[PDB]
Amino acid sequence: RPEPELIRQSWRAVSRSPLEHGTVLFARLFALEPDLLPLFQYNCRQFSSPEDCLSSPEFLDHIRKVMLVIDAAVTNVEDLSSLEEYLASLGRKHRAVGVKLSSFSTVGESLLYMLEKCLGPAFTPATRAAWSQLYGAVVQAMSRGWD
């Protein structure tokens, strides 16, 4: 299990303003994997129109949802196995809308970048490792959707 106290304490820095911190995660995501941008712009096209996609209700609602799923991983940090079936269903939904499984690895890198910006020196190697472990467990359960 990822160290529960390290996870809970560090998550409090970002969890209460999910769009402020979530937009940081997604800005990093696009800087590391620019090719993801057309996938969101096309999703925006389906919802309404692609203009101002990164300010759109569907794009910001998606950030809120990513932050909510990360919060569930935090509240279930002691036994992440219980989320496995929920996450497998979410992973299968992503594959069905055309998201690459490899893009989830960039989300992990972006999650660590967002946390470090907020925590600075409090983001110790132990805390970074805990988050690496927690996110690893999340992406592993979501990857079941690729079965």
Place this chain on the structure above:
Amino acid sequence: ERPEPELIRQSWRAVSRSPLEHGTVLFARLFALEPDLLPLFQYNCRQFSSPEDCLSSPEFLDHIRKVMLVIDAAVTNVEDLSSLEEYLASLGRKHRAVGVKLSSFSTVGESLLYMLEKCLGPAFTPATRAAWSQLYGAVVQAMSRGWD
């Protein structure tokens, strides 16, 4: 037995056009039946006066988003709801821990049907009503396991 998938998918698309409004409908009905559930969302909205101010609290609104995500998962796995059984039992355990009485989940069922009836109107046909009753029936059965 198994909730008719197309009736579930079709009706859920309509309700997820406005999740915050429709989720608020579900909780408004639930609070009219069991007003004592509202304080469970007041941990950062500590007021006995005008407690409706707390329906605009982030914890209440994020919880609506959480409820919609769970239903979204039940809709995605509508062809095999047993696939969510261990997750739902753990989710049941979490609700028992915050102090939700097991009987309050029968009231959630009534509130869900009320919410679906309000937003769907004539589209909430006897067949669509039966599919949602079967879907909630399966969800609440797995959730009840969290009480042991």
